[PDB]
Design a protein around this ligand. Structure first.
Ligand SMILES: [Zn+2]
Ligand SMILES: [Zn+2]
Lengths: 78, 105, 193, 48
């Protein structure tokens, strides 16, 4: 049960951050003037590790989830 | 195309002073009003559109060579569905013999 | 064996020994080394530049295009194609949102209507303004309007490019070409931008 | 099977430069490779 729950959460986060790694939620591609993107609040050290600083992984995920949801079902339609 | 009202030929399209004039080889000339303002067209991804698979999706529950899935149909409450995968985006559609279609079709 | 990566048989050896031109190469590759050493170590920096370097033509963002013999209609009284007459509804919004983008005097009787593939705009992460700005920079002899980049499925995004009279002054070296053949060629060069 | 479940739930999202079909095939080809530990049962059965 715990394996299934943790795997579902991990897979959701991995898919979200593998989508928004070059994709910018504010359109186009990311603009890294630092570890942090300029158009968004994406840090470079969050894309691949979602466990060291989970709060910074739960903030970005919370910011661009609804749109992520609309985009996700837009490809999978028609 | 435009069809001549007398010889039923395909009239040739010419453009003059913001007007489209159809000239036939029989001498008949006509003016198009609205339905003739389409010079050319092209649609893309023709092998993956919805109109390409309409008959196939309609026939899918009856073809015995299609993949079946263990899922309840929300309409007739049959306990299996037909799963089809179309296109290069691998769109999954579940269809049932009753007429149910995921993607709301 | 796929197109662009064909390395089957002796295809690449034949490309070398026959001194075939670059247009005849089926598996051509290149290795690009970054300039900034700080960018060099970071993989997101390398990944963003690699995705920045990827040929997206305007043609591959299009679901369909229609070549219409229409001029500009500032009012609701001019004639349009019947299937696309509802496009005039978002035209008025385009005027009310672009005070400095006004339609000029030299607009011809030629319109190319474009239907954007919203899935490709999402999968490739391409904004509407990136397309519009790229088209306006490369094609100064056209007038471009578009709908809103809406987020609701079933409401499409429409690109409409009105040609200008200067587009029909350029083609003089081939004097046996009418405006229809010129406008089609302009459509071909718009798609390849 | 887990990849197929993600495909059925629309949870497979390709990166830039790949279609969903190509990314799904890349996932399936990588998932169906024998691990290095396949030789443990082989070397347990044999006397070198
Ligand atoms: Zn960003
Ligand atoms: Zn049913």
């Amino acid at each position: 049960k715990k394996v299934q729950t943790a795997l579902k959460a991990s897979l959701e986060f991995n898919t979200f951050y593998a989508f928004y790694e070059s994709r910018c939620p504010k359109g186009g591609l990311h603009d890294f003037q630092d570890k942090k993107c300029v158009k968004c609040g994406l840090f470079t050290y969050i894309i691949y590790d979602h466990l060291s600083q989970p709060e910074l992984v739960h903030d970005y995920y919370n910011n661009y989830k609804d749109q992520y949801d609309k985009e996700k079902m837009s490809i999978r339609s028609i | 195309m435009k069809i001549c009202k007398a010889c039923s030929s395909c009239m040739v399209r010419t453009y003059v002073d913001g007007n489209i004039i159809f000239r036939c080889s029989c001498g008949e000339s006509v003016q198009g009003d609205s339905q003739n303002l389409l010079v050319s067209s092209k649609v893309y991804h023709t092998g993956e559109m919805e109109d390409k698979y309409k008959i196939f999706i309609k026939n899918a529950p009856f073809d015995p060579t299609n993949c079946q899935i263990k899922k309840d149909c929300p309409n007739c409450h049959l306990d299996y569905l037909t799963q089809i995968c179309i296109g290069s985006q691998k769109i999954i559609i579940l269809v049932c013999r009753c007429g149910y279609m995921s993607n709301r079709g | 064996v796929a197109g662009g990566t064909n390395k089957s048989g002796i295809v690449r050896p034949q490309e070398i020994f026959s001194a075939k031109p670059v247009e005849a190469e089926q598996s051509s590759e290149m290795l690009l080394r970054l300039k900034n050493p700080e960018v060099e170590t970071n993989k997101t920096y390398a990944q963003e530049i690699a995705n920045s370097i990827e040929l997206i033509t305007f043609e591959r963002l299009i679901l369909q295009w229609h070549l219409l013999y229409e001029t500009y209609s500032s009012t609701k009284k001019n004639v349009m194609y019947p299937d696309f007459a509802s496009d005039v509804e978002w035209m008025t919004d385009f005027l009310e949102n672009h005070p400095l983008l006004q339609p000029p005097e030299d607009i011809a009787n030629w319109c190319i209507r474009l239907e954007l593939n919203k899935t490709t705009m999402i999968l490739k992460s391409i904004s509407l303004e990136s397309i519009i700005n790229s088209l306006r920079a490369k094609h100064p002899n056209t007038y471009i309007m578009h709908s809103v980049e809406n987020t609701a499925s079933g409401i499409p995004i429409i690109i409409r490019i009105y040609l200008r009279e200067s587009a029909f002054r350029r083609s003089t070296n081939t004097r046996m070409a009418t405006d229809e053949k010129i406008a089609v060629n302009v459509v071909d060069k718009l798609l390849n931008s | 099977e887990e990849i197929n479940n993600r495909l059925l739930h629309g949870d497979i999202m390709p990166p830039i430069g790949l279609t969903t079909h190509d990314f799904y095939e890349k996932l399936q080809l990588n998932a169906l490779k024998f691990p290095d530990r396949i030789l443990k049962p082989i070397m347990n059965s044999i006397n070198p």
